[PDB]
C-alpha cells in the first residue's frame, strides 16, 4: 500500500486512487438527471425525505448561477455550493470585464480548470462533487454540460448522475429530444425518475424540477406548481 494517499503520487500502474475514491463517493448521492429539449433545457432532481422534521424547500440540490445559467449538483453539498460560489463569481468577472453574458463553453472551461487545480497537490484534496450545467441562448441555442470530479466536461443531448446512473440513462435514450418542445419533457423527465428509487430503498422522495429556455424568456427559474402537479398527475400511470 501507500500508493493511494496523496493527489501527487501515481499508482504503480500509473493512476490516482484518490480521484477514483472521490468519484466513488458520487454514487452515494441520490440522482441528478437533466436533458435538453428542442428549445430549452430541463433539469430533474429527486430528493429523499430523511425525516418528517425537515421543512419542505430545505437544502436544495438545485442551484442558480446566473440569470440564465442553471446548476444541478450531486456530491458533498458544501463543496457543491462552494463551486457554485466561485462559478457565480466567475460569471461576475466575465460580465464585469467584458459587458455581456458568459457562454457555457467558456464557463465550464474555467470551472473545469479550477476543479483540475485541486488534482495535483498533497496540500489539498479533490472535490467529491459532480454536477451538470445547461442554459439557453437566443444566439447559440441550448447547451448541456456535465463535470466529473476529475475536471473533464462534455456536451450532451442528455446526462444522468447519482445512484442509478445506467438504470436512469437506459430509458433516456428511448425519448426523442431532437424534436420535443419541453412541455412533454416535463412529464417524461418526471416519469423516468418516477420509475426509479423504489419504496424498498426510499421511504418517500420529493420531486424537484428546473426549467430554462426561451419559453422561460431565457431566464432560469424553477417549474411552476401546476405543471409539476400535472407531472404527479402523470406519475401513477406507470403502474400498468
Amino acid at each position: 500500500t501507500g500508493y493511494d494517499l496523496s493527489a501527487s503520487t501515481f499508482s504503480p500502474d500509473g493512476r490516482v486512487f484518490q480521484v477514483e475514491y472521490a468519484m466513488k463517493a458520487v454514487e452515494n448521492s441520490s440522482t441528478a438527471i437533466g436533458i435538453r429539449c428542442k428549445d430549452g433545457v430541463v433539469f430533474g432532481v429527486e430528493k429523499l425525505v430523511l425525516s418528517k422534521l425537515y421543512e419542505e424547500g430545505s437544502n436544495k440540490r438545485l442551484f442558480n448561477v446566473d440569470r440564465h445559467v442553471g446548476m444541478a449538483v450531486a456530491g458533498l453539498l458544501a463543496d457543491a455550493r462552494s463551486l457554485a460560489d466561485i462559478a457565480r463569481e466567475e460569471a461576475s468577472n466575465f460580465r464585469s470585464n467584458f459587458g455581456y453574458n458568459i457562454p457555457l463553453k467558456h464557463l465550464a472551461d474555467r470551472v473545469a480548470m479550477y476543479v483540475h487545480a485541486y488534482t495535483l497537490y498533497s496540500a489539498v484534496r479533490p472535490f467529491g462533487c459532480s454536477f451538470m450545467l445547461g442554459s439557453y441562448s437566443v444566439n447559440d441555442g441550448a447547451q448541456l454540460y456535465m463535470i466529473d470530479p476529475s475536471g473533464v466536461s462534455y456536451g450532451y443531448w442528455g446526462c444522468a448522475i447519482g445512484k442509478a446512473r445506467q438504470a436512469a440513462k437506459t430509458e433516456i435514450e428511448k425519448l426523442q429530444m431532437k424534436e420535443m418542445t419541453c412541455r412533454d419533457i416535463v412529464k417524461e423527465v418526471a416519469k423516468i425518475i418516477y420509475i426509479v428509487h423504489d419504496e424498498v430503498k426510499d421511504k418517500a422522495f420529493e420531486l424537484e424540477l428546473s426549467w430554462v429556455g426561451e419559453l422561460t424568456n431565457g431566464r432560469h427559474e424553477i417549474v411552476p406548481k401546476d405543471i409539476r402537479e400535472e407531472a404527479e398527475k402523470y406519475a401513477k400511470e406507470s403502474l400498468k
Binding site: 501507500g2 500508493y3 493527489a7 501527487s8 503520487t9 501515481f10 499508482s11 504503480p12 500502474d13 500509473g14 493512476r15 490516482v16 436533458i35 472551461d109 473545469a112 480548470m113 483540475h116 488534482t119 495535483l120 497537490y121 498533497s122 448541456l144 476529475s150 475536471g151 473533464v152 462534455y154 456536451g155 450532451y156 443531448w157 442528455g158 446526462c159 440513462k169 433516456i172 435514450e173
Partner: protein, 240 residues
C-alpha cells in the same frame, strides 16, 4: 532497484532511474487512443480516431484537435483534464510571445517552452507530472512544414513521421518502412499513407465519422479541420 521513496516521489533510484515519470508514460496509454502525424514535402497532416459511445453525447464536443494560433494547431493524447490545461498554457505562451516580440512564434520555440514548463514538475518533488503527451505542427519560412512532439518528461524532437498512443510502436514500425523507400510525397500521398497507417495497424477500414483530420499546407498556411464530406472524398479516393 528501489530505496526510500523513489517509488513515491521524483527522486533517484539506486539504479539511477526515477519511477514516477515512466509510470506516467503509460498513463497516456490508459487513455485508449492512438494518433498519427505525417510531414509532407509542402504540407503536414494530423489524423486520429475518436470514439463516441452514446447518442446522448454530442459528437461535436470530442475534438482532440486544438487551434493554438492562426497558423498553429495541435493534437492531444493522454488524459483530457491535463491535456486541456496544457492547451491553455500553450495559448497563453503564444500570445505572450506575440505581445513581447510582434511576430509569430516558431513551433520549435513554443515546444521548447512547453518542455521547459513540463521540466519543472519532474524537477520538483511536489507536483504530479501531467500524464498527457503533446504533438504540434507548423509552417515555417525557409523550413516549410515541421512536426514536433513533446513528452511529459520534457524531451522533444523534430520528426518526419509521428505516431503516439497505444499502437505507437507498431505504427512507427509501419512508418519507417513507409519512409525508408524515400519517395517524394505530395498532399494526397501523405493523406493516404496517414490514413492507411492506423487503418492497417488498427485494421479498421472505417467510415468517415470516427476520425478527425487536421492539416496545413504551404499554400494556405491557416490551420484547418476537414469536413466529413472531403474526408469521404479522400476515403473513397483511397478505396480504389
Amino acid at each position: 532497484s528501489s530505496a526510500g521513496f523513489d517509488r513515491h516521489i521524483t527522486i533517484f533510484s539506486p539504479e539511477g532511474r526515477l519511477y514516477q515519470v515512466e509510470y506516467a508514460f503509460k498513463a497516456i496509454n490508459q487513455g485508449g487512443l492512438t494518433s498519427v502525424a505525417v510531414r509532407g514535402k509542402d504540407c503536414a497532416v494530423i489524423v486520429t480516431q475518436k470514439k463516441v459511445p452514446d447518442k446522448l453525447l454530442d459528437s461535436s464536443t470530442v475534438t482532440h484537435l486544438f487551434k493554438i494560433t492562426e497558423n498553429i494547431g495541435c493534437v492531444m493524447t493522454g488524459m483530457t483534464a491535463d491535456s486541456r490545461s496544457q492547451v491553455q498554457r500553450a495559448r497563453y505562451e503564444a500570445a505572450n510571445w506575440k505581445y513581447k516580440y510582434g511576430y509569430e512564434i516558431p513551433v520549435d520555440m513554443l515546444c521548447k517552452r512547453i518542455a521547459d514548463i513540463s521540466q519543472v514538475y519532474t524537477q520538483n518533488a511536489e507536483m504530479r507530472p501531467l500524464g498527457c503527451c503533446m504533438i504540434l505542427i507548423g509552417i515555417d519560412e525557409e523550413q516549410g512544414p515541421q512536426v514536433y512532439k513533446c513528452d511529459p518528461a520534457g524531451y522533444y524532437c523534430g520528426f518526419k513521421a509521428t505516431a503516439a498512443g497505444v499502437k505507437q510502436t507498431e505504427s512507427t514500425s509501419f512508418l519507417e518502412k513507409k519512409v525508408k523507400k524515400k519517395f517524394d510525397w505530395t498532399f494526397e500521398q501523405t493523406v493516404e499513407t496517414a490514413i492507411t497507417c492506423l487503418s492497417t495497424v488498427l485494421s479498421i477500414d472505417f467510415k468517415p465519422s470516427e476520425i478527425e483530420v487536421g492539416v496545413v499546407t504551404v499554400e494556405n498556411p491557416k490551420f484547418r479541420i476537414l469536413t466529413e464530406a472531403e474526408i469521404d472524398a479522400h476515403l473513397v479516393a483511397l478505396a480504389e
